[PDB]
Structure 1
């Protein structure tokens, strides 16, 4: 109606739209799959128009061109979660990294700590009432829309309409750039015997009626594959994957025993194949909500029989968990790992569990093996899940309980699930670290 005039008046080309960015601006992209590639391309192509423009976002499936050293006078990448195409800049020094809990991002936007001069977002074209849909992200995207000084939208008719807090009226957007292209996809991972074993251990901790949080990759896919005997599972998760769709259509996940958002998979973003995007579209069983709801520890605490499944990179004898860095090298980010660990620990029913899982070993490129159960974290590594936060740790060799357990008993339990080849070296490190014998037993049979 009146809105159609607004929409038409504000429609332009991508090259025109990015002229609204000025030197010194803080620019933010919509999260993950909602990043607008045509707008990002235009901004990068217009690099010489800009001096010292901050570019922030979290995980990206895009090229991360603005993060390359040649652009360092034009753009400064400020990642809140890094990925293969942007992590190089952080290692090299011209890119920056902010450690921030995923649930807290909207708060930092509202507080103007994460000030947003220009927000760039991909959306569906408007419905009959002038509401566009973000489709695949709610997360921090919805707050950014409200708080940004200028919102630039790539209107892509391949974006799905998904229920929840995903809608933005055309009157809230400054410029529209019309496009049509498929959304980025991630492939399904290969599951090895190591991951299969991890999934089986994780599955043994999951009872009927559990509310699940899990991500993407071989580990959560392995877990899901081992849940086919379970009943009435629910979802309250930062994201769902293609794997969750499989378990839903197997009849295992039905959200019938949830305490809040009953009958619905409650999520904050989507990332997978087009099969996932199609599933989520116009589906009463799926609802996207902002990250300061979904990942809020006080909200997770209200979930029934919460089971949160997340991966790490290494765990030390004290139960310090490193998940986002290898020594001084930054790889990803905390994301929602600690949000859900905390929510499960705070669970009002007292039934919440947080599982942190990893292969027990890695093969280095020189051919040698290394233990991911370690006496000490790598030099300069960031602790992601602190020793006080730690709950269950799982490898292909079993389950170690950290919660309420002493440093010595944590180390004993971790060594017990370490690779057999490393156990003697690790027990020697135990004795040096703790000034105590590994074995708590002492049988008179052995003098």
Structure 2
């Protein structure tokens, strides 16, 4: 209740804030832009000085912030990445480890993103949680801002919660998004712009793909857009729609643009009517600023947002996810690393399932048909190893050559229709392959 007093008792330096974290304990942090740079630098420094060891860090959605501090290769003997999702940061670490005498340096923790809250709080257990927050308001509350995800839960279930106040972090309304100072163990202040997702140049194939996808988006569709450039870039084509809704895991600039234009009203949703629901946000500064105190944008935790049963309660859900490869059985693969699968923990399958279960819903998985200047086919005979989207779950697939609904189709019907979405240069090859596999 004496908010000023509490703030001044809890306010400290980043070095002091991280100084009592035990060795051999479990730490977690916010996703992406919520990773707190001052705390993480101080924690890394602690490891550099030899003053902490066996620290397991459990996390999703890596940013350069962690990549350049606690996840630096030279510290991996002291701060151990227990990555629950593998990004370019971890790929670089993994590759460097193999080159360095066949060393394992990333400890992948297989999981479902939608189960991350209970997994982190219960099976794993988190001793310290750290997250960037918006400044304290006059009622004593901080906001998790661009985060909700697992963070709203672990901020409370962790034995210690340390915040990094940043005036660049928007004050976001949402379920369990606000945290009272009495629930915070320590505070540091570090006012710096949030890290930005790099803006990506649109490749030509996205034009056709965006137009095919647009025609599959019905009146009053309830949108989810997966991570990546393509789902972001498809929003531009929806500029002339009306009464769309949002219920998405990641909130991106494309979706916020539709909000700003008044295309998104959320008035046809069954749940959260009148507000755009998301579980974490990635974008650029103008998007981040726009979230501040927005009364029609409402974050919710991932065990709600990515629950296929919840997703399905809204009619006409459209889920738009990107993938890297599609094989002739209709299985899809979003994982960059060869002969490994770390991207099934990303939550896209929750929306593949939820969108199909939605009345009038559609799940779309889209990719350009080729890579490497047309020399490599993204439509392939057979994904090598575990897939991201099982062939039994795939609904629509899209390339720049059109769309196919796979549900109910035989192996033969799938193979023949999928081949016609491949680039012309590969169709004969794929057809021969289908026969060898005895799909046709």
Assess same fold via TM > 0.5: yes
1:385 aligns with 389
Indicate the residue corresponding to 2:93 in structure 1. Answer: 89
Give the CA deviation at 1:244: 1.8
Offset, 1:125:
2.2
Which segment drifts farther, 325-334 or 153-162? 325-334
Alpha-carbon contact 1:323-1:334 (below 8 Å) kept: no
Residue 443 of structure 1 aligns with which residue?
none
CA distance in 1, matches of 2:111, 2:281: 20
Shift of 1:329: 4.9
Shift in Å at residue 239 of structure 1? 2.1
CA distance in 2: counterparts of 1:368 and 1:155, whole angstroms: 47
CA positional deviation for 1:73: 1.6
1:310-329 alignment runs, 5 A limit: 310-329=321-340
Partner of 2:9: 9
Shift of 1:119: 0.6
**Aligned partners of 1:10 and 1:326: how far apart in 2?**
43
SS, match of residue 99 in structure 1 = coil
The Cα of 1:95 is off from its aligned counterpart by 0.7
Match of 1:440 in 2: none
TM-score by length of 2: 0.93
1:368 shift after superposition:
7.3
Compute the displacement of 1:154 (Å).
0.9
Secondary structure of the residue aligned to 1:85 is helix
SS at match of 2:200: coil
Answering whether residue 429 of structure 2 is matched by residue 429 of structure 1, we say no
Which string of whole-angstrom CA distances, capped at 9 and with x for unpartnered residues, describes residues 205-236 of structure 1? 11110000003543123321221332211111
- Report which stretch shifted further, 381-390 or 1-10: 1-10
- The match for 1:441 is none
Q: Which residue of 2 aligns with 1:418?
A: 422
Which residue matches 1:356? 365
Is 1:116 the counterpart of 2:116? The answer is no
Q: Which runs of 5+ in 2 are unaligned?
A: 98-103
Q: Secondary structure at the match of 1:121?
A: strand
Query: Which residue pairs with 2:78 in the alignment?
Result: 74
Q: State the Cα distance separating 1:354 from its structure 2 match.
A: 0.6
1:337 CA displacement? 0.2
Could you tell me how far 1:127 is from its partner in structure 2? Answer: 1.1
2:39 equivalent in structure 1: 39
Task: Give the CA RMSD over aligned residues.
Answer: 1.7
Map residues 74-223 of structure 1 onto 2, 5 A cutoff.
74-91=78-95, 92=97, 93-110=104-121, 112-165=122-175, 166-223=177-234
Cα distance, 1:172 vs structure 2: 1.1
**Structure 1 residue 308: deviation in Å?**
0.2
Q: Does the CA contact (< 8 Å) of 1:124 and 1:134 recur in 2? A: yes
Give the number of the structure whose alpha-carbon radius of gyration is greater.
1
1:355-403 CA distance string (max 9 Å, x none): 011111111xxx771111111113xx43111111111111111112221
Q: C-alpha distance in 1, partners of 2:259/2:37?
A: 31
Of 352, 371, 376, the residue aligned with 1:370 is 376
Aligned residue-pair number: 428
The alpha carbon displacement at 1:2 in A equals: 2.0
Q: Normalising by the residue count of structure 1, what TM-score does the alignment of the two structures yield?
A: 0.92
Counterpart of 1:339 in structure 2 is 350
Please say if residues 219 and 311 of structure 1, whose CA atoms lie closer than 8 Å, have aligned partners that are also in contact: yes
